[model samples]
Target: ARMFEMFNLDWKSGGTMKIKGHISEDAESFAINLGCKSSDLALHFNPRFNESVIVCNSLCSDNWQQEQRDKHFNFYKGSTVKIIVEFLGDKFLVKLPDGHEVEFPNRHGYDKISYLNILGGFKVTSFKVE
Candidate 1:
């Protein structure tokens, strides 16, 4: 399960974004199934939950983007979160469940993706590697 998708397409309607992903073993909580149909937000940053990585600027202050926060990373839907990508660095700063962490950009030249090809809900999902 190592999808590692990529996107941008003109700053996706706005601007300022990031995406990174890469993990394999380190799961205490891992579940990010967006598959959205309407709701879509931004700003999630799970740099290890409390290890400091939260920049929820707006988490969706307008329409889409999770219809203005429906479950940024741990609100409900498939709730489980708390992976942390082995503790930073090496790409995996996701937030694309809509709450926009964006930074799922760890191509590693082309490998070690983890799993994140979510179509509808946008993208970004649980990883491993710890």
Candidate 2:
């Protein structure tokens, strides 16, 4: 029941991204990646329903970095979720539907992000970058 979507966006510093979607009732997890390429992910936002944790990480040269975990179980399967990601000079600030905000470093230190990928059992109804 997993799926994937890739978007090429003109994301730059001070840009704000909004993703509106729903997690399938039987979903186990999902991830949102931002960067120039999959191997150089600046931010990896992952929500794991089965484990009841949200993990944040980065990928550099195909190697995964340390994982940052938010132990709050605010997301539920089959629920609608809105994710807001804001790009800063040195990091990305993410706001979850549950009003939780987390920051992840921009490892590549790029002013612009050209790629975005979404994966797992979630339906993206809308996506906007402004």
Candidate 3:
């Protein structure tokens, strides 16, 4: 997992976040998150290999909202994938590994986002914000 934080980052200011990684065939689940703080995650993107679903949600002040579950689960274990995210003023547009797209609102309307976290079960090769 890759862990990093930017105290005053403004990701909504024309930023595009990119992540590249590979899931171990033996891995069951993994997750990626970005927010103003860990306790205030604006985006939670999770993949459950065992469950065969892709889950997305928000954790605002530690409160988890309803999940946006995508059953199109196309990425497979042992495959390297690229994920990209672009932040609009009030929403986030995510492009999945297989070109599938997802849109989740910026519910809190935060102007700045300072952290990103990749939780266990997969290997993150590179992560960039541009």
Candidate 4:
């Protein structure tokens, strides 16, 4: 038996979240989606044990370089993200914004990706399983 979950946050600052799920043997893939106003977010993912995991990377603003590194800013103004995972035998297909997709090895360790965190300015609207 498999299921999906969802989370939501305010439109000003970024927030973090933690997820716990079982990695199905027949588990096809995993996906994520984000929603927010055009200038309401800076989004990032923080995995439990993997710090090098680059979930998504892009600045929402052109003048983003002018702001201090520590001075947090939000990305995805008046927009949202929908991540879908499709099982393709030995790999998982990851879809992102800008029509970009990537594949990651579905190794045994990643069977359970139980943690997710957000930063700066968006909210998780909803999720589903097929």
TM-score order, best first, reads 2, 3, 4, 1
- lDDT (10s digit) by residue, model 3, range 1-130: 5443445566764679988887888878888888987789888888888889889899977999998988878878888889898887798888987788888888878677788878867687888887
Residue 106 deviation, candidate 4, in Å? 0.8
What's the lDDT for residue 20 in model 2? Answer: 86
- For residues 31-123, what per-residue lDDT tens digits would candidate 2 score against the true structure? 998888878888989989878988999898899999998886688898888999999989999998778898888876988888888888778
Top-scoring candidate (lDDT): 2
Each prediction's RMSD to truth: 15.3, 1.6, 1.9, 16.6
Winning candidate number (TM-score): 2
Show where candidate 3 strays beyond 4 Å.
Answer: 1-8
User: Over the full model, what C-alpha lDDT does candidate 3 score relative to the true structure?
Assistant: 0.81
Worst 10 residues of 3 by lDDT: 1-10
Give the clash count for each candidate: 29, 0, 0, 12
Per-residue lDDT of 105 in model 3: 83
- Please identify which of the two predictions, 1 or 4, would achieve the higher TM-score against the true structure: 4
lDDT of each: 0.29, 0.86, 0.81, 0.32
TM values, all candidates: 0.21, 0.92, 0.89, 0.34
Output the TM-score of candidate 4.
0.34
2 against 4, candidate with superior TM-score:
2
